[PDB]
Amino acid sequence: GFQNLWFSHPRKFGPGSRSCRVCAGHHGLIRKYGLDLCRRCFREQARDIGFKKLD
Amino acid sequence: MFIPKSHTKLIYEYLFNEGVTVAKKDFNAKTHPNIEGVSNLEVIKTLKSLASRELVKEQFAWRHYYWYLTDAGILYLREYLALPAEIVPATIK
Amino acid sequence: DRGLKRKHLALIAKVQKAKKAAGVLEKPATVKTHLRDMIILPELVGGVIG
Amino acid sequence: QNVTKKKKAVIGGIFKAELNNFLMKELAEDGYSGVEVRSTPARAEVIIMATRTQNVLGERGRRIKELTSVVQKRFGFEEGSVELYAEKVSNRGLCAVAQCESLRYKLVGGLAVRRACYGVLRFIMESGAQGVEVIVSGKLRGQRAKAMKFVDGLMIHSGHPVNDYIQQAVRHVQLRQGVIGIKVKIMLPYDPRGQNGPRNALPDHVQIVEP
Amino acid sequence: HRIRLTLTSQNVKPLEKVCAQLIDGAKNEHLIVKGPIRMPTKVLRITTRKTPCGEGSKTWDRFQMRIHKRLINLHAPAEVLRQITSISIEPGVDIEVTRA
Amino acid sequence: KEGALRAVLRAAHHADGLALHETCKALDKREAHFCVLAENCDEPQYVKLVETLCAEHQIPLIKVADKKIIGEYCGLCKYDKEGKARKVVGCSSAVVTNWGNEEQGRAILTDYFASKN
Amino acid sequence: LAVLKYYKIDENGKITRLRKECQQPSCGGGVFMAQHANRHYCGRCHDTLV
RNA sequence: GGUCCGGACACCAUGACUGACAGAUUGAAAGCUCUUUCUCGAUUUGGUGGUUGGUGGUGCAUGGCCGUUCUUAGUUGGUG
Numbered sequence: 001g002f003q004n005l006w007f008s009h010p011r012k013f014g015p016g017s018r019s020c021r022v023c024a025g026h027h028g029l030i031r032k033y034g035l036d037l038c039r040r041c042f043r044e045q046a047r048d049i050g051f052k053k054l055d
Numbered sequence: 056m057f058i059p060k061s062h063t064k065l066i067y068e069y070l071f072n073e074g075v076t077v078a079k080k081d082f083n084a085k086t087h088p089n090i091e092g093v094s095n096l097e098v099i100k101t102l103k104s105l106a107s108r109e110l111v112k113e114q115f116a117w118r119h120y121y122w123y124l125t126d127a128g129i130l131y132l133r134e135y136l137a138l139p140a141e142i143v144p145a146t147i148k
Numbered sequence: 149d150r151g152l153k154r155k156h157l158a159l160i161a162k163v164q165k166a167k168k169a170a171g172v173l174e175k176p177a178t179v180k181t182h183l184r185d186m187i188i189l190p191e192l193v194g195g196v197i198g
Numbered sequence: 199q200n201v202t203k204k205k206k207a208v209i210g211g212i213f214k215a216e217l218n219n220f221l222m223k224e225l226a227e228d229g230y231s232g233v234e235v236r237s238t239p240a241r242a243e244v245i246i247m248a249t250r251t252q253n254v255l256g257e258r259g260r261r262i263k264e265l266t267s268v269v270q271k272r273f274g275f276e277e278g279s280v281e282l283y284a285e286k287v288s289n290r291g292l293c294a295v296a297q298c299e300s301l302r303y304k305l306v307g308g309l310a311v312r313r314a315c316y317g318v319l320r321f322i323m324e325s326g327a328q329g330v331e332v333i334v335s336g337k338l339r340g341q342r343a344k345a346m347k348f349v350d351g352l353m354i355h356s357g358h359p360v361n362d363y364i365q366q367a368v369r370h371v372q373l374r375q376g377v378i379g380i381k382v383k384i385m386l387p388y389d390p391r392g393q394n395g396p397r398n399a400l401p402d403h404v405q406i407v408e409p
Numbered sequence: 410h411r412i413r414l415t416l417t418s419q420n421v422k423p424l425e426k427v428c429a430q431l432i433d434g435a436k437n438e439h440l441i442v443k444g445p446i447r448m449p450t451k452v453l454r455i456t457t458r459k460t461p462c463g464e465g466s467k468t469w470d471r472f473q474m475r476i477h478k479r480l481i482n483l484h485a486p487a488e489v490l491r492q493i494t495s496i497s498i499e500p501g502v503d504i505e506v507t508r509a
Numbered sequence: 510k511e512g513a514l515r516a517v518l519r520a521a522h523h524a525d526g527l528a529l530h531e532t533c534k535a536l537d538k539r540e541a542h543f544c545v546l547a548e549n550c551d552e553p554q555y556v557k558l559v560e561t562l563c564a565e566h567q568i569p570l571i572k573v574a575d576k577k578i579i580g581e582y583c584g585l586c587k588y589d590k591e592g593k594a595r596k597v598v599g600c601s602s603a604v605v606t607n608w609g610n611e612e613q614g615r616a617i618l619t620d621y622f623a624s625k626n
Numbered sequence: 627l628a629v630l631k632y633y634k635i636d637e638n639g640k641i642t643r644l645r646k647e648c649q650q651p652s653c654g655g656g657v658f659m660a661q662h663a664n665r666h667y668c669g670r671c672h673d674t675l676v
Numbered sequence: 677g678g679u680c681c682g683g684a685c686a687c688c689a690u691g692a693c694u695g696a697c698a699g700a701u702u703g704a705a706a707g708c709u710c711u712u713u714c715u716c717g718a719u720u721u722g723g724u725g726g727u728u729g730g731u732g733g734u735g736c737a738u739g740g741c742c743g744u745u746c747u748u749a750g751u752u753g754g755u756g
Contacts, residue, residue, distance in 0.1 A: 001679095001695090001696080001705090001706060001707070001708095002679075002680065002706085004705085004706095005679070005680090005704095005706070006083075006679090006680070007083050021117060021118065021212075021216075022117050022118070022219075024080075024118055030455060030457075032453075032455060033204055033205060033208040033453060034205055034208060034209070035208060035212070035455075039457045039458060040461045040741085042455065042457060042472075043457060043459070043461075043470065043741080044740090044741090045215045046455075046472050048211065048214055048215035048218055049208070049211030049212060049214075049215055049474075050207065050210075050211040050419055050474050051211075051453075051455060051472035051473065051474045052472065052473065052474070053470060053471065053472060054471075054473055055471070056681085056682070056684090056719080056720095057693090057694070057719055057720065058719055059716090059719075060525065060717095060718085060719070061525070062719095063719075064525070073267060073271075074264060074267065075264055075267045075268045075271065076271075077268055077271045077272045082682060088274070089271055096682070099682090100682075100684080103684060104684060104685075106684085106685095107684045107685045107686095107727090108684090108685065108686095109685095114220075114223060114224055115223075116216075116219055116220045116223050117216050117219060117220070119272055121220075121268050121272070123264055123268075136523075137519075137520070137523040145267070146260060146263050146264045146267060147260065154705075155703085155704065155705090158704075158705075159703090159704095180702090180703060181703055181704090182677095182703035182704075183703075183704095198703090203417055203451070203476060203478070204451060204453060204476065206503075207419065207453075207474065207476055208453075211474075234500070236500050237503075239503070239505070335738090335739075335740095336738060336739060337737065337738060337739095341736095341737055341738095342736090342737080343737075343738055343739090368739095368740070370739060370740080371739095372739095375737080375738080376737065376738045376739075377738055377739040377740090378738085378739070379738090379739045379740065381740095458742090459741080459742055459743090460741075460742040460743070461740085461741055461742065462741090462742075462743095464742080464743070465742060465743030465744075466742095466743060466744080468742080468743075528717090529627075529629055529691080530629050530691070530715090530716090530717070531716085531717065533629060533656060534656035534657060535656075537655040537656030538655065538656065552627075552630075554630055554635075555627075555630055557635060558630050558633055558635060558641070561635055561639060561640065561641045562633075562641060564639075565640055565641060585718085598691095599691095627691080628713085628714095629691095645714090653715090657714090657715070658714070658715085659713095659714070660697090660712070660713040660714035660715090661712090661713065661714085662697085662698075662712055662713065662714085663698095663699095663711095663712070664698080664699095665697065665698060665712095666697095666714090667696085667697045667698075667712080667713075667714060667715095668696095668697080668714075668715080669695085669696080669713080669714035669715025669716085670714085670715050670716075671696095671697095671715085672696075672697055673697080674697040674698070675697095676698090
């Protein structure tokens with residue numbers, strides 16, 4: 001019933017198994033080093049994280 | 056939301072004991088990291104009811120609800136849970 | 149080897165039951181299914197699947 | 199635990215960013231300015247730089263205690279391992295975030311855009327900043343959006359010295375018509391003592407030892 | 410025994426300050442100190458599209474974080490470690506001791 | 510003694526032991542200390558039903574004529590900031606699985622309803 | 627109010643259960659099983675008994 | 677095609693209301709519905725306000741960001 005039908009489908013891999021940690025979006029996700037931030041989340045948070053535009 | 060009275064019991068007990076409660080915005084999770092027995096959905100909905108009744112103060116950031124017990128909440132929870140007036144949440148201590 | 153699933157086994161059972169409950173002169177009742185990844189095994193041969 | 203140093207650095211950065219965002223969303227009324235994280239392996243110290251430590255701490259330091267509990271529970275620390283300390287920012291007029299929130303509050307209250315912007319500009323300039331730029335953009339007058347810029351003093355834009363001398367902040371205000379964006383930039387003054395501004399002078403400013 | 414001091418930081422100046430302080434402490438206590446060994450720096454690069462949409466000229470932001478690591482070898486069985494390690498400390502530098 | 514009964518019932522209700530449909534299952538476990546009934550139960554086959562099971566399992570009972578007062582004897586009504594009994598429901602029967610407040614009176618009512626039975 | 631339908635009050639005064647009581651390890655006396663046409667279904671549990 | 681409310685809170689209401697064996701049913705082990713009568717029992721259910729959610733419209737209502745004009749040397753007060 002509902003118990004075994006609400007979220008039956010596995011979400012172990014693929015784009016649907018991950019999300020930006022700030023907006024919960026599946027598109028353009030940076031997984032390098034376990035950042036788990038979208039390409040738009042990261043541009044805003046990079047200075048706080050410790051990344052800099054050197055060259 | 057339909058929640059067992061026992062589950063509401065544990066939720067209120069933890070909230071009063073700690074003074075604060077945190078829950079990730081994940082309805083599907085079946086286990087709250089801090090409160091045992093109840094599901095993330097039940098925790099979220101119970102504390103959302105508290106916030107709507109102004110018994111708790113709600114904040115949200117980066118897919119995470121934070122909730123602070125208020126004075127209306129401290130009165131309501133004590134009267135509902137039937138504790139002595141001497142017991143107080145860890146935050147007030 | 150990885151194993152047919154419970155829904156697939158239920159479909160096989162349904163088709164076999166429909167085939168049994170049908171005279172040779174006529175055709176078995178049609179069994180409607182969503183399972184497009186089911187393997188066509190001899191158990192299903194003869195039956196009518198939608 | 200056993201975690202590579204790369205992942206340790208990234209985890210520390212993520213933690214600091216999330217903490218900064220949460221405190222910005224919470225203590226905005228308390229004149230929040232910033233946060234510093236000294237995550238010693240034993241205990242994680244978190245300094246909350248605000249303009250008014252009174253409100254941050256709350257009655258007998260209850261608000262800070264609540265925040266410590268919430269941070270511990272959210273980030274999975276151990277009871278008493280993480281500790282918050284309030285701090286009073288020296289010069290509020292030289293902190294762009296604090297002035298941005300002040301302008302936010304004035305605009306929410308209903309002060310005229312020009313009046314509030316000029317008041318903030320004058321206060322920041324009297325606080326000793328070399329220059330200040332305040333931009334308020336959105337539906338300020340009518341249906342068509344417009345951006346109003348207020349400038350006084352001198353301000354640099356290009357080159358590395360920007361990273362040291364310029365301090366910026368951005369905020370939103372939701373009024374009936376829509377959202378309005380506030381941007382505040384402050385060029386800090388050259389402070390040899392390194393309290394009101396950068397310790398090193400501008401690279402092109404050659405200063406002469408008088409004979 | 411060989412005590413290994415691993416000091417890692419994302420900024421060179423505080424890291425070298427702390428390293429010099431530890432070296433000075435060891436020399437003052439007249440310990441067998443092995444000079445600061447400089448591990449190759451680790452550069453973490455993220456290159457992203459600047460636009461939040463797909464429009465415009467294709468421009469990329471190149472972000473990079475640097476990590477510098479320093480090794481110090483000490484032959485100190487006495488608790489002079491506790492002192493030299495406790496006195497010197499600075500934000501942004503993380504130090505760890507190993508009993509190699 | 511009504512106040513003592515109400516105080517005893519309050520703690521049981523808080524402890525989630527205070528309980529018709531549920532009352533039967535309570536005394537089938539013989540976890541019931543006592544039951545409170547009403548003489549206003551019009552259903553004749555209903556009144557005698559509850560007394561027999563209470564008697565059969567050795568769980569003597571207290572009879573309070575009208576039902577609406579037992580409804581008040583739960584705390585299940587909403588108040589006008591003064592304990593004002595508002596919008597109560599029938600409580601033809603109830604059970605107390607676990608003991609409650611009024612320890613001294615609770616001691617009295619244990620002797621009271623047992624001594625006279 | 628079918629609660630009274632699973633109890634027969636003997637004329638002398640004692641009672642006899644009119645429904646097959648359940649025998650699950652957890653749920654026992656009190657909880658009754660449905661008087662289905664061919665089976666008997668526990669409500670608190672599954673425990674179908676034909 | 678089908679399922680769940682994950683419709684807070686307030687107000688007025690009328691064992692309120694959940695859940696699941698088996699047959700039927702369904703793509704379906706979906707108590708979704710119908711046969712069936714069991715079970716937790718104030719959280720619910722109906723209605724009225726109000727919320728909530730929406731990768732729904734509007735980028736010609738907006739913020740922020742980016743692109744471009746424009747990778748060129750170009751631009752602005754004060755006092756005269």
